[model samples]
Target: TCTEDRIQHALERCLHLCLNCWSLQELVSRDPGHFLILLEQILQKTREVQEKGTYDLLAPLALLFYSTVLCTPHFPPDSDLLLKAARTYHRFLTWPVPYCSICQELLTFIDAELKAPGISYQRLVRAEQGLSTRSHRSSTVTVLLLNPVEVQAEFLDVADKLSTPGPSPHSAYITLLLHAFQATFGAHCDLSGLHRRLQSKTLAELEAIFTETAEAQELASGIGDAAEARQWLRTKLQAVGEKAGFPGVLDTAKPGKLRTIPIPVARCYTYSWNQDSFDILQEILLKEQELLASTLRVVVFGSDRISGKVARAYSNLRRLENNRPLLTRFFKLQFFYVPVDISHYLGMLDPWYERNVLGLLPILADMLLYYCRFAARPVLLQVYQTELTFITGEKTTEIFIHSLELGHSAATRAPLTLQIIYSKGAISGRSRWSNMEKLCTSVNLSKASTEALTLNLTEVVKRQSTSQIKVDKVQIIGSNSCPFAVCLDQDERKILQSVIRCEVSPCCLPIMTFS
Candidate 1:
């Protein structure tokens, strides 16, 4: 009874169906018979369009079919077929041309169905795969609808019973917990400010600050109670505690025994006070290590110089001490800081002093100073063969003369002379000289010493050698005013004077400019 045009007309007419007719409009749950006949007609027309090799006519018809199939309730919400249809529509929505208002409407309808209660995990999986495949928009909305809190709640319920004996029966739970933690932190729940506060104050003080924040106000308003927001933060902390092997308790018999420890909860949570006991300290350290290892790998030293530099470095050290476990896994962790006055000294001691000494000064200053002093310890009249060769050359005569004057002294000792050389275009050679310059620039007398001295660069050259080994010659030149002489007893001074007399020269000291 129906001709080809009649079938085609019917399919086009169905596309304009009203949204209120849930039976057909809600495509995911619609009856199969009504839509099946229309699908068959669409297929026949699709084949005809293919045979004729014309896509323009098929495009509109295909769009209509797609809109109807998606909205029609032909299968269960979680069915694999429905998942495929959802993916198909998701792909269609990405096309630039062939826009259909009906397809967009149907997609909105699909979003609602995908979010409907009791939707299968398998369907959700398919939707995620589709989004990932297309690099699609609306990923955030889909993730929100996935409802991670429910998953987190479910994880907590089974978390305690998960056996550790086998090959990680709790892997799923761990993955779920990681996802939940990321989601919670990603929601703008920063805890760094709170973590710092807790270090210097008690829980009562923390509560006062928490109540004043805009976030706390918003959360309180949403829950219709200020106390609930406080409780909610406590619950978040509790969840983090559970992750760190400290399960939360409803009521403990030994309330006094409960020590309030500050922990990094996605960089949130505060402690009532610092723990001093060995057992609590170790426990706290372990917890902090777990936090650092899992959440972040980079350590930041707030200020690079002067007063707060040490304080900032100490703060990060506490974080690193807490995250020791995770730190071991990485071959290297990055550090960042602002440059300060001491940075000048560090630069001279080790060009890489930022990595070597800046981080360890507060904890190991004495040890570091000793190593640094001995590593490039001052010596009198040291010379390199390259310097001698450069001095002999006509073009480098002035440089050689300066070197001789700097290294000659009428007293018992000469000023320290360090000669550095490099090959043209050698990276390692360049780096070595750079580090040496840093070491020389950083040297200084003891804080109590009255002597003021500066390193002078006298010579430089490019030369060939069998190997890149530096040759240094040491000879006592002369000393004038002794910085340590006042601190010595008569016997010590007499011995030092005799030692100086053995190396002193009769010649007057060079009259070179100090600058």
Candidate 2:
């Protein structure tokens, strides 16, 4: 009598808890092993009631236990309680009595979990397979391991057999099967392979096989004709590409040129800045109003095959101005210029052209402009004197001077002014006056000079009287009346003079003079 009362009380408690469940927190607070033992005891009592052929309440109890176990975050992977719960649901499926909506919903949840990719799903699959083999029960577990291709082909055959003049009686059932196939393998399904296999079938048969819906009917009809099938396949592939975020599927029938093109040396110098440096350089370029509206075509040569040293040097330069934009416009207009192979263009005239000029020139020019505009004046002067040595492997500064002359000539012809600011140095074999004369003579005597231009050279010097005493002077060499002279305005000249005079510190005055 005591044992019966205890069983009665346990049944009542479990039923009450299952019906009026407040929250999962209450269930999870209890030990999982204890909870599972309680569920098994309740399940055993339910089975005993069913054996007596009385009004059995096993379905609700089984569903309740199954749902509760699934809700818990942590459960034993090979839970015997879970296996028994699944078997209870499977028993309902094979029973003579029709399952209610609650039983059917529990079965659906079990089916979904078995198909999912995780430990719980694998456990369910193993449990079902073991039950089917050991207990000699007919189960759908084998269907899970069926080859997709064979299953699809079987579906196609079924649809073909069900074909009639009008819509067949089995049309709805076949349509459901097709829906299942699509839902299971739509993303990775090889439609092309399916199409090839379906080719051997008659057009009418193909139409019937695909006639699940309006779109399916159209696809089936298209497959009957070669031209329509091509168009349809193309549209499908395009849709797939768009869904996958590609512009379109590439066509391999046609090919385009694949060789590199050569860019001019001057153009390379102009477009040397990368994305981070572009904005700053563009701002500076905008300040020069003449270059603002001009269609500036800045090309980079040998950009693809840049030497590691050159790249490292450029990287260092960028780090020097890390706080500012280094390559903004450079990124924006990356495709604006095409890179050229200089050696290929010159037909091996001299390999030195690439080493001394093409590759290094643009980078050098960019560094000079950036340093002159934004770097410390002393650093700029030092760089200006020794920059060419980094590229040319020459000790003398003549190459640097020559480069400046070349840049000045190019700027003048483009109707731009060329200005140089420097600190006065000791008079040596290479005097400022003599260099200025050489620059003027080179500009005037060259066949390229159609217009005269003035090179405004500013010489900064500190007086001996006072520590801060100084005199700023600008020496205008070459003709000023030339069309390409394009001299800076009086205010602009005064600004340049002040900047140069202030930037030349006393400490750098020794090395500031010409070599």
Candidate 3:
């Protein structure tokens, strides 16, 4: 049917077809019927090329079959199809190399995702969906230990001591430690006389006495002998007096002479107008505690917004760093100022602060009346290790500190009242703070109304440790609806409102921070 040269050309064309089919068979392992059909067509083209001597048509047909075999989809997970393509294209010397960087990257990426084989992507998707459920359902609080080395050392020390077994709860101890720190800083320095002087003089005289007392104590303690330490302290005290032209002021002065001397008492009395009455005094102390809590919350959460408060209260305090005088005194005073300043800010933001922050003015005056009480009371138990007591002179301040200690102890022995709410949903979807709604529902108030109540109710509740505060009405935006449109639309307004009003307990909200 053909010349010798024609037969040679047809044979060459058949050889090319066979080579492509073999490569497809390695991966697909599917029926060979399609390959057979393609081969028959290729032979026809080759016959025509041999008979008519048209090499161009024959060459194109061969190339078409080559690509079709390589790119065709195969059965059972599509892995075979992809594997075949990869194998066929493995040789860099191949006619058509895989030149697309995007395709190469995608191949690698898919391989990584599929390392575990079938349904890997589906498994990952499901695991992510169930994260919130896993987090909330578990009773254990998982703390991830990260380190910044320098700052982390102190934080970890406290955390480790807290984890240790002991009679006192770590939290209570922390509160006591905080109070002790204030006292050690000379927070109780009686500087009423300096008030008539300039603000600088008041602060200077008070800070100087604080510093001197601390330095003297340190010098005495360095001797490592109580009797010797006391002697050293006495010498230091005398030196300080002599340097200030007031040698033997403590003993040589008439009885009650120091009492008559004006001194700045941390400006605690300035908070309240009233210097009398037990109830007003109690309110002032409660307000101070509330102020402290609010300020601490701000520091932990709104550091960017309320940074000034932290700077003023915590920065440049030699006593906080050096650990001088009685540790209790240092801590108590530190606590006192932070709460007072924070409460001052809170009062500006919250209307109830007037009644709470400044309302106990008269009670502070009565607290000073007991200046002589220290002479009779045990020095250890005299001040009650509280910031509020030292600041606003509220009786409740002492009670609240005791309550925190009690709660901390109870927490160590058993489960606390705290609970977490969790859910499983798409991370890209709307935020599911729905637990807030549930919290609100428990109290029979909508989110909007509940937040309104929280803003108003936190005022009176500041003093009381118990959760019996009442909410007569919740008015959002001074009306019935929420003021912020975004909060309402996002359903956050309701959650905030409901959570704040639920059970009147102290709860920490989980919020994301950028650093």
Candidate 4:
């Protein structure tokens, strides 16, 4: 007939329009008003077959109508058209009917476009490069998979930016776009949920890299002999002390000389303050752990009297009794170490004590060592000239948790009371003891800091029976035969021991639990 060719051409055009619309729609979050116009054009194209009175074109026309209404949104809302389109597409997709040669050719073209390497796909590849670069140093990579529709749109945005020339590949516009996408996604998306979905691709890649890199680092760090490392550290410390005008105090014979004195370790428990089911303490601890591989421990320190009584009162009338424990099990034993200079530690507390008290008042008398690993050598020395400052309020006992360096399964949380203490001389007198007692009482540590226990340098000195081992001097003297005789004044020994204990106890606390 006269109109048969025209009808066939319109049908072909309609299919093209439908396929393009679908592809564009997938790239964007939502389509604007223009998309509805495209749908209408497709519908009109299908109607031309009816006008031609060609019975053979009916099935093709039906399929087009079905796909348009079912798979795509309508320009002008029509419930009947929507339902028909959905049912038709469903039937066609589930059990396909035979297609004429023209329709079959059109289907092939549509499939090609759907799988085409478009600008959106190109952006995805570029974005992956930037992502890989960012995670290069880390053992595991976390590729966050977002909504496919949104991802497609984001890809287009990045492609547009990358298309513009930049100064260099490192600072390229595409890298900027990738970073912007990551930042926005981090802010808006629930990444943890996205992580779970990428089990096969992203997660599997993370696992493989994590396993490989971790083992490599472990073997690399443990390359040298232990005795040789210790001897080297002793020589280095002795040289530093001698250069700083205190040569006689560096002891080469004592490998773990910093272990004899008392170090401050606090034990406390965290509890749910209210019934909100929110884990405030755990979240806080996790945050602190990420800051440093600081040791942490959770110890159960009995119960809060007021809360325990109230809980028991509420449970008295319960028929099907709750089997929950009366006392909440909380983590205990937190270690605090001064990670800065001994001079810094001294400067930090000395001024505060001088302002408040008459005599040389020991505010928070302790020493901290900075264990610097430089060029594969461990330099155990006091931080030369830095100063320490307390961040939290006066005696506002703060807690922190630090994960072990490839040693523990979970991070440990520890409570620390940051106080300022000073000694008049290398050996503290009665005045220092009184001041420590006062500070201890002010911060609810009266039970731990007793009269006999409070900063007693005299007692510490008395325990050192060797006349050669003078606890009051800050200088070290060596025998002429062994050039490495390092002398430790009592003050240095006490402070070093305290810092070591605070840093090491958290690592061993878990072992103590099983034993």
- Among the numbered candidates, top lDDT falls to 2
lDDT over C-alpha atoms for residue 439 of model 2: 24
Per-structure clash totals for the candidates: 21, 13, 36, 23
Where model 4 places Cα greater than 4 Å from the true spot, the runs are 1-223, 251-259, 266-278, 282-296, 300-512
Location of the lowest summed lDDT over 10 successive residues in candidate 2: 506-515
Clash number for model 2? Answer: 13
> Residue by residue across 238-348, what tens digits does model 4's lDDT show?
343344333433332322111111111111123323331112333554544462112233211112232222222222211112343221222221212111122233224
* CA error at residue 485 for candidate 3, angstroms: 15
> Which of the predicted structures, 1 or 3, would earn the higher lDDT when compared with the native?
1
Ranking by lDDT: 2, 1, 3, 4
- Best of the candidates, TM-score: 2
How do the residues 279-313 of candidate 3 rate in per-residue lDDT, one tens digit apiece? Answer: 23234345544532111111121122132322322
Task: State, as a TM-score between 0 and 1, how close model 1 is to the true structure.
Answer: 0.18
Listed per candidate, the RMSD to the true structure in angstroms reads 27.2, 31.7, 36.8, 35.0
Give the range of the ten consecutive residues with the poorest summed lDDT in model 3.
374-383
At residue 445, what lDDT does model 4 achieve?
11
Tens-digit lDDT track for model 1 on 1-515?
34434445655554332221222223322333345455556656555654665534534454445445442322322234434445555544544453344346545544433333111221222222221112221110100011123224332222222211222212222322222222222222323332332345444433333222223223323453423543564455445434443242212233211111111111112121122111222334456446331112121212222113232233334345466533324212222222313344444433333333343312122222222221221111111111111222211111110112122121223222232222222323332222232111111111111111122232333349111222122112123321211111111112112121111111110101100
- Assess each prediction's global lDDT (C-alpha) against the native: 0.28, 0.30, 0.27, 0.25
